[PDB]
Amino acid sequence: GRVIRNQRKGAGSIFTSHTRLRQGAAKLRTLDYAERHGYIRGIVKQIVHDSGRGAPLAKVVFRDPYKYRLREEIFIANEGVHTGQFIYAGKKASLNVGNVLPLGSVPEGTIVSNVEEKPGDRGALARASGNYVIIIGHNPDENKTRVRLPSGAKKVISSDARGVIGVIAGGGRVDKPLLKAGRAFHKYRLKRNSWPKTRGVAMNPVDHPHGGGNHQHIGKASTISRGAVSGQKAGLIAARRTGLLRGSQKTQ
Amino acid sequence: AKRTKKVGITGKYGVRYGSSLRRQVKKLEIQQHARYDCSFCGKKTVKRGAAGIWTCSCCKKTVAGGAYTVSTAAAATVRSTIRRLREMVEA
Amino acid sequence: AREITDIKQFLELTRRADVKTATVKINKKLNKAGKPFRQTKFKVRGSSSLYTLVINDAGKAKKLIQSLPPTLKVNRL
Amino acid sequence: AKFLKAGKVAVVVRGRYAGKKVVIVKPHDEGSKSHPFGHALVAGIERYPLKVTKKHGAKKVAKRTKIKPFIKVVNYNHLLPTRYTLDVEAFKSVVSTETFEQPSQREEAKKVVKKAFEERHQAGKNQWFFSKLRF
Amino acid sequence: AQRVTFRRRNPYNTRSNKIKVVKTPGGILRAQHVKKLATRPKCGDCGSALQGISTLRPRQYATVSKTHKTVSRAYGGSRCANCVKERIIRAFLIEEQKIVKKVVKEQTEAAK
RNA sequence: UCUAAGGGUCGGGUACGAUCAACUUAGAACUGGUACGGACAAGGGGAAUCUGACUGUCUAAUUAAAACAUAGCAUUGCGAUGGUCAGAAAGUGAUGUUGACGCAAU
RNA sequence: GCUUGUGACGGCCCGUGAAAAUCCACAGGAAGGAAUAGUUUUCAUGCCAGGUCGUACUGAUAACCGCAGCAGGUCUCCAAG
RNA sequence: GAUGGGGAAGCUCCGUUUCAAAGGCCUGAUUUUAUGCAGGCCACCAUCGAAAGGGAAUCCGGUUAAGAUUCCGGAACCUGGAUAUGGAUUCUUCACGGUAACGUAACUGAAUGUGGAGACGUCGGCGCGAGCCCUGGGAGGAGUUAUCUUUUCUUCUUAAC
Ligand SMILES: [Mg+2]
Ligand SMILES: [Mg+2]
Ligand SMILES: [Mg+2]
Ligand SMILES: [Mg+2]
Ligand SMILES: [Mg+2]
Ligand SMILES: [Mg+2]
Ligand SMILES: [Mg+2]
Ligand SMILES: [Mg+2]
Ligand SMILES: [Mg+2]
Ligand SMILES: [Mg+2]
Ligand SMILES: [Mg+2]
Ligand SMILES: [Mg+2]
Ligand SMILES: [Mg+2]
Ligand SMILES: [Mg+2]
Ligand SMILES: [Mg+2]
Ligand SMILES: [Mg+2]
Ligand SMILES: [Mg+2]
Ligand SMILES: [Mg+2]
Ligand SMILES: [Mg+2]
Ligand SMILES: [Mg+2]
Ligand SMILES: [Mg+2]
Ligand SMILES: [Mg+2]
Ligand SMILES: [Mg+2]
Ligand SMILES: [Mg+2]
Ligand SMILES: [Mg+2]
Ligand SMILES: [Mg+2]
Ligand SMILES: [Mg+2]
Ligand SMILES: [Mg+2]
Ligand SMILES: [Mg+2]
Ligand SMILES: [Mg+2]
Ligand SMILES: [Mg+2]
Ligand SMILES: [Mg+2]
Ligand SMILES: [Mg+2]
Ligand SMILES: [Mg+2]
Ligand SMILES: [Mg+2]
Ligand SMILES: [Mg+2]
Ligand SMILES: [Mg+2]
Ligand SMILES: [Mg+2]
Ligand SMILES: [Mg+2]
Ligand SMILES: [Mg+2]
Ligand SMILES: [Mg+2]
Ligand SMILES: [Mg+2]
Ligand SMILES: [Mg+2]
Ligand SMILES: [Mg+2]
Ligand SMILES: [Mg+2]
Ligand SMILES: [Mg+2]
Ligand SMILES: [Mg+2]
Ligand SMILES: [Mg+2]
Ligand SMILES: [Zn+2]
């Protein structure tokens, strides 16, 4: 048989990200002396649109504590931050929207974005437009800080991990209907060649597990096991349940 | 003279895409093209471009906001719940 | 490629070391709405620029012709 | 208190001497045929003395501490009145309305203001009027 | 009714291949390629086309005298003279308030 | 072959005058073998049933369609020591200049 | 009026619409610099030099690809009444 | 797509700043003398890849059987290397003038840093430029003229800098 579509993507020829116009990589500052003993001041020189990205970016320039020079970082714009604002970054730093603080140093209920998984990875969690994490407690011995991630998951990370106070700008973007193919076209045009999607049930069997038949149908259960092998996994991979989710969601 | 009975700005799509989709768009589209009051300079010159980004005509300030409206209700309460928590660390 | 009117500066150009050749041009034109007059153009060829002095006064022209340095090649007309 | 008077130091906020410190010597608080606006005759500092160190020696110090002054009519709205102040007696009779108009009179005037300033810098009276504003 | 042709191999209408039509002393029409238009320099502080400064293409600023590339006040060919007015007042006021900040918290240390 | 309406430009003590230049539109007479968008140019319309919402896409060289796509709807996987995917292997690689308002799979 | 150029604006975006070479400016003040005479080549003028390869013509119902001087195919500028 | 490297029996595969001791400029030191060392920087880390992207600088007239923005003529411009005379500047050494926007023939400026230009979608109407189109008077040439037409056609141009 043929090699099915989801298998071709890993080679990354026509499926690599459409990257030319991107502003750069959004990252917290390097976790240097200033940030983990005191705090450092910067000015958001500009907040700007990143192509293919939901949320606007915030260009925030600092002084270099070791050489006479300006060094600029690329933050994700937390909603409310503006051109000309002073951003503070450090262990001892005020709990104001836009500043970046180690998770250990904010009370419970704090709402932060771009938070680090391990301390120093310059921003892992809560980056897409409209997302955030909430701190739900602390364990001062071992200095963990229990947080809740946008999925609902409740991970526990180091209290040294850094997050930026507030939520990420550009929320509600997904409440507007795309309304027509072209909008989705220009959407994925600046992300990657994932659109449009021929259904595996409209191809011949060479092409897909779902292919063929004199009527258009899946033919066997579309729930595929985790242990399935490449070229088998298409449909509902490892589905622990299926069907229209009725009743209240919201993890207990 | 009143030109259209309900479609308003949404009349450009005409009959296509279904009344309800058009209705939802018309809301956010009206939300997103509008002129807003500027916090800094007290004029109503904030307008959007590039969802998330809101800059003021004069006074040249640019604020990060919601995708089709300046302030989003979420970030609004987050402002206050941070205001509340902050005050717990001085008094 | 340059125009000149300072008759003093002009003679200073005509004796500038690099200047070896010049030329006088005689044109017949009219005077302000009516009769004709005789315009002369003194063109001094410098090593990188051609200076030309327009002397509309016919009398100022003749006096300025003999004023020319004797060691200067001066193509007539 | 009416403060733009004959002693107050100010910063020139527009023009070529923008950012440099001055002293009012004689205020024309309201109008002039020539200058129909609130203006002040001020002597200022154009090229400040360069910072001097112990490593600086015999004739380097004498060179480093030379001062280039200037004299200017200046609208009030282009001055920033400072809290400090500096005495004006050594060149009261020099920085005048008559002083401008005749370049020669401005040239001599600057000489008086120059020596009166360089003496003031040594034995560092006012110590701040002689410290370049950085911006 | 007289038509014209490019004067360089490049046959397409690219921005580096702009054309002007011109009437010559021969009494005929002939194209003449036009360099791309220059843009004005900009205040790094505010962003306006900072006045006083001549507007050329960047390599041409090396064939022009310094007076065309500056104005006499501080931050001449760099900032727009209202930003200079501002970075003056801001500088002076901050240095003043900075003095206020010290002796206030010096008296704090003497009475607390 | 006529009528009417629609403009510009210059002095006025601290109502108008004078002059120059444009096809538009409407109305009225006269006139012809009743003809006149005179060639050229230039929509047939209506009432229904089936079917795909629509614009869009494909069997180059017998199939353009009701087929594919699409927006919308719904389900599934995954918090990076990860999901899906590539490779003989690797201090290898795609998604990823990414982080659940995300990526991947139906 | 027509073609093109350009300006100040306005509409649109879950699309907000390259990069590097190169050139200039400013901040800075290291340093060097005159009275019996210095500093000045971003002002003017003057001196020398600028290599290597392409450059014909066709560009199509006959100069290209379609076994060919094939009714096919093959990127584009100028454009009168 | 090389390179310290890491795979692979191996042809070779992977990585491109990548777990690498990765390199070169300004001038001072010399008066054996030519370039050793005395400073201080830069840690930027190959290279290939556009005859439509970016980009130093030229025009008009004339000329050939066949070449021309390339020859001829005349008039420029850029870049690099030399440089000297004139102007400017200084005894208040490193220009003055304007309230200001800013003005100018000039009007010293190393390291370092910073700003700008290169450098950017699309459509719409509105404003202006150019070349074209239309047209009046005149000064010429041509056509028609049984009759009509102060008519029909045509010349009246001005490059870079
Ligand atoms: Mg297979
Ligand atoms: Mg990539
Ligand atoms: Mg595709
Ligand atoms: Mg589909
Ligand atoms: Mg699908
Ligand atoms: Mg099929
Ligand atoms: Mg199969
Ligand atoms: Mg199966
Ligand atoms: Mg099947
Ligand atoms: Mg089915
Ligand atoms: Mg200076
Ligand atoms: Mg050619
Ligand atoms: Mg200037
Ligand atoms: Mg100028
Ligand atoms: Mg009329
Ligand atoms: Mg009239
Ligand atoms: Mg029919
Ligand atoms: Mg259809
Ligand atoms: Mg077919
Ligand atoms: Mg077949
Ligand atoms: Mg069809
Ligand atoms: Mg067919
Ligand atoms: Mg439905
Ligand atoms: Mg290994
Ligand atoms: Mg065109
Ligand atoms: Mg834009
Ligand atoms: Mg510049
Ligand atoms: Mg020069
Ligand atoms: Mg060579
Ligand atoms: Mg040829
Ligand atoms: Mg032929
Ligand atoms: Mg053929
Ligand atoms: Mg004609
Ligand atoms: Mg390789
Ligand atoms: Mg190359
Ligand atoms: Mg090229
Ligand atoms: Mg090019
Ligand atoms: Mg020729
Ligand atoms: Mg020949
Ligand atoms: Mg030829
Ligand atoms: Mg020649
Ligand atoms: Mg010549
Ligand atoms: Mg030169
Ligand atoms: Mg001067
Ligand atoms: Mg630069
Ligand atoms: Mg730029
Ligand atoms: Mg470009
Ligand atoms: Mg030219
Ligand atoms: Zn404002």
SS3 letters across A100-167: EEEHHHCCCCCEEECECCCCCCCCCECCCCCCCEEEEEEECCCCEEEEECCCCCCCEEECCCEEEECC
Quote the CA–CA distance of A197 and A208 in Å, as a whole number. 13
From first CA to last CA, the distance across chain E in angstroms is 94
Report the residue of chain D nearest E81, measured CA to CA: D14
The answer to whether residues A128 and A108 touch, using CB atoms and an 8 Å cutoff, is no
Tokens of A176: 């507007």
Report how far apart, in Å, the C-alpha atoms of A242 and of each of A101, A151, A153, A209, A239 are. 41, 19, 20, 19, 7
C-alpha–C-alpha distance, residues D44 and D17, integer Å: 9
The experimental method is X-ray
Residues of chain A in contact with residue B74, where contact means CB-CB under 8 angstroms, are 130, 167, 171
Pairing verdict, β A162-165 and A100-102: antiparallel
**Resolution, Å (one decimal):** 3.1
Q: How far, rounded to the nearest angstrom, does the alpha carbon of residue B3 sit from its chain's CA centroid?
A: 25
Q: Does D128 touch chain E (CB under 8 A)?
A: no
Contact A123, A132 (CB under 8 A): no
Estimate to the nearest angstrom the gap between the alpha carbon of E28 and the chain centroid.
Answer: 39
The DSSP symbol for E63 reads G
Helix extents (H) in chain E? 82-110
Helix (H) or strand (E) holding C59: helix C58-67
CA E55/CA E61 separation, integer angstroms = 9
Instruction: Report helix, strand and coil shares of chain A as percent, to nearest 5.
Output: 10, 25, 65
Between D and E, how many residue pairs show a Cβ–Cβ distance under 8 A? 36
Question: Angle at the Cα of C17 (from C12 to C20), degrees rounded to 5?
Answer: 95
CA dist A4 and A203 (Å) reads: 10
What are the φ and ψ backbone dihedral angles of A230, each rounded to 5 degrees?
-55, 130
Q: How far is CA B28 from CA A175, B53, D15, in A?
A: 8, 15, 50
Q: Per the structure block, which two tokens stand in for C29?
A: 């034109």
Q: Chains B, A in contact: 3+ Cβ pairs under 8 A?
A: yes
Our CA-based measurement puts residue B19 at a distance from the nearest CA of chain A, in whole angstroms, of: 11
CA–CA dist E21, E33 (Å, integer): 9
Distance, CA of B81 to CA of B90 (rounded, Å): 15
Cα separation of C14 and C32, whole Å? 31
| Cα separation, D53 vs D49, whole angstroms | 12
Give the containing element (helix H, strand E) for D79. Answer: strand D79-85
Is C50 in contact with C14 (CB distance < 8 Å)?
A: no
Provide the 3-class DSSP secondary structure of residue D83: strand
**For chain C, how far is it from start to end, CA to CA, in angstroms?**
19
- Here the tokens at position C23 are 């030329």
Looking from the CA of A97 toward its CB, the CA atoms found within 13 Å total 25
Number of Cβ within a 10 Å radius of residue A135: 22
Give one word for C55, left, alpha or beta, with left for phi > 0 and alpha for psi -120 to 50.
beta
Q: Is the CB of C15 under 7 A from strand G?
A: no
Identify which of E19, E61, E89, A184 has the alpha carbon closest to the alpha carbon of residue D82: E89
Chain B environment of A47 (Cβ under 8 Å): 53, 62-64
Collect all residues with Cβ–Cβ distance below 8 Å to A126 and sequence separation of at least 6: A112, A113, A114, A115, A132, A133, A149, A150, A163, A168
Cβ contact A189 with chain G strand, < 7 A: yes
Residues 6+ apart with CB under 8 A from A128: A54, A55, A150, A168
